[PDB]
From a paper:
Single particle apoferritin cryo-EM data were collected at 15, 30, and 60 detected eps (corresponding to 16, 34, and 78 input eps, respectively) to characterize the performance of the camera at different dose rates. Greater than 850 micrographs were collected at each condition resulting in 183,110 particles for the 15 detected eps data, 251,816 for 30 eps, and 203,117 particles for 60 eps. These were processed identically in Relion and resulted in reconstructions at 1.68 Å, 1.68 Å, and 1.87 Å respectively. The ice-optimized map had clear evidence of the Zn2+ atom, similar to other high resolution cryo-EM apoferritin reconstructions, whereas it was absent in the earlier 15 detected eps map. The two samples were vitrified from the same apoferritin preparation, and the only difference between the two is that one was plasma cleaned for 20 s with 4 s blotting while the other was plasma cleaned for 50 s with 1 s blotting. In the absence of the ion, one of the liganded waters moves 0.5 Å away from the Zn2+ binding site, and the other liganded water is no longer present in the binding site. These lead to changes in the positions of multiple surrounding waters. Finally, the imidazole ring His61 rotates 22° away from the Zn2+ binding site suggesting an induced fit mechanism for the ion binding. There are no other observable changes in the peptide backbone. The only other appreciable difference in the two datasets is that the one without Zn2+ also had an apparent water ring in the FFTs while the one with Zn2+ ions had no evidence of the water ring.
Author numbering:
A (entry chain B), B (entry chain A), C (entry chain K), D (entry chain O): 5 to 176
The structure:
Amino acid sequence: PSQVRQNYHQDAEAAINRQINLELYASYVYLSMSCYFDRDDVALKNFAKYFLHQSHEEREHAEKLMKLQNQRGGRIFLQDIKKPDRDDWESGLNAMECALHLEKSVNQSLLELHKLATDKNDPHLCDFIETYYLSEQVKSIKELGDHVTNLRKMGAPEAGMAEYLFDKHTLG
Amino acid sequence: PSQVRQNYHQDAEAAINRQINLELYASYVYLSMSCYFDRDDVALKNFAKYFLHQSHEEREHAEKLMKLQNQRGGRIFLQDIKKPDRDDWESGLNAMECALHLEKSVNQSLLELHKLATDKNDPHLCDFIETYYLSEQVKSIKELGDHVTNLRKMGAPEAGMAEYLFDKHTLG
Amino acid sequence: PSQVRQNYHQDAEAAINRQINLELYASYVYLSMSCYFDRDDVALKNFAKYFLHQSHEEREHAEKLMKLQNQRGGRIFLQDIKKPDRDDWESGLNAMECALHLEKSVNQSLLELHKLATDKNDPHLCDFIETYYLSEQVKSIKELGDHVTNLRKMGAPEAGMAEYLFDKHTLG
Amino acid sequence: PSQVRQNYHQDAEAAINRQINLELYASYVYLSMSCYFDRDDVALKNFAKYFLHQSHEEREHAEKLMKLQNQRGGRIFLQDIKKPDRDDWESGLNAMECALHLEKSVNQSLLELHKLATDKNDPHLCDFIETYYLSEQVKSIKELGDHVTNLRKMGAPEAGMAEYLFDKHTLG
Ligand SMILES: [Fe+3]
């Protein structure tokens, strides 16, 4: 195969391609969320900024996996990026809950990739995932859980001032 | 006894050892509180920061008493640091009320130590307690009482925005 | 369980709580050592400074494990912090030997925690331990072994100038 | 009496005059020690510097008591400053032991003055002594005890390198 390839299983290559698609999908979901909060009938600018940042971060995760694939002598095969499950995200609280669910699903995929790398005795790939993916995901999940907790306590979405003040104080 | 020891009663030495343990216990209680507010289902970062600061301050108080004990030629005897009375502190308001109670109990211990030093005609120890402990405790107690008053007025813990906004404005 | 919890075994949670207690215990042992060297009949200020630094570092290790526990959605349960095995540490050499023994016991606990995380297929926890605990412990153990070697060669504790000059040159 | 005098007992005035003389005597003892270490057959420049500093500090203590006496409307009555008990201080260790004894005797005098001020219900004088005299004395006594401990451990005065190296490392 590639002149650089060493200790890199075909299964791992395939799993990395899958993960690239999942990170691109996550970026697209975040972009959809960001847009929602930019609507004139929603109008929460710091929610919009928060989710646009997350969109840009997930793209960066995807690009770093592409760099890995080429560094190890695998070949990138792209697939369609599916549209998000919804256009209307209903509320700041609902979007944060949906983001938490998404981040946990991405984490689960990364844990399955680490298990595969461990099985195939690929320590460079195991180390890569941990170093750049697993601690970031744990941090993200904890931050989103904290946001959900705060919004729920404040009375969102029925208490009208809750998302407004959360947008100002936590996300601003 | 020690070559430096002068006008330092065995009772006072024993009472200082007790006070060291109480300050270490207080530090541990504050650490427990700090952690509680860091939970994903509580998620009040400025409450967590406030109590972690208090934990570090109480350790410093303990270390300053250790320095005193050696300066006067007493001998430090450490004891177990008991675990705090609870793991779940329930709410920002409840933690502030528990902190107020703790600070008053530490103050009471310091007043008993001052009375002992006065009885044993130990002016250096009397002056030390006042200079570094008694005004700090009065300031701490007043600050915690002010926090409790504000949280109660705002409607905590039942009014969901109260602890959130107090965390932002008073503790942030 | 917690909304953030994912791939985090109850065994691992329990083992982290145990490790928190061990790091707090180590901090307390170091504090005891620090105090000893501050006595008027011992009077080795740089030994005192060295062990006080180690005390503060072990507390920081404990606080970082608390942060991990909450990040993963576990719950911190604190226990009593037992008093150190002795009040009188006898000599600079004996304290360094006792510190070496303590650091090796903490390392052994961390290796058992890593083995548990490996068994439960928890790569985030495995990576955390290594990244922040295992290399620090190896460095600490090597430094303490070097100190013990030097003090022994110099003739401590029977050669009276040995601890004095080591305090000045190595620890100063 | 003086137009400024208020709540200032004749006993206290007399005791302050005595304390002035004792601080001037202590300054003179330190000056004698300083000179000794400047002899060509002793030649320990940092011991000489240390005791000259102490001499200048004790003079400053005396001058501050003179300022107090006039601030309270007492009248300063000076007495002869007796010569020190010896001209030859024998060794660095012996001079430090003699200094420790002197500092403890000055502390004892200050504690007797505080007891008198307490008896005569003179809180300004009690506070003055503590604020500027009692903590300084405790610090001085602890420092001298530490020096004596270190010199003894190092083998002074029989181990010829002990005072030389202490002069370099501790006092330099
Ligand atoms: Fe506001």
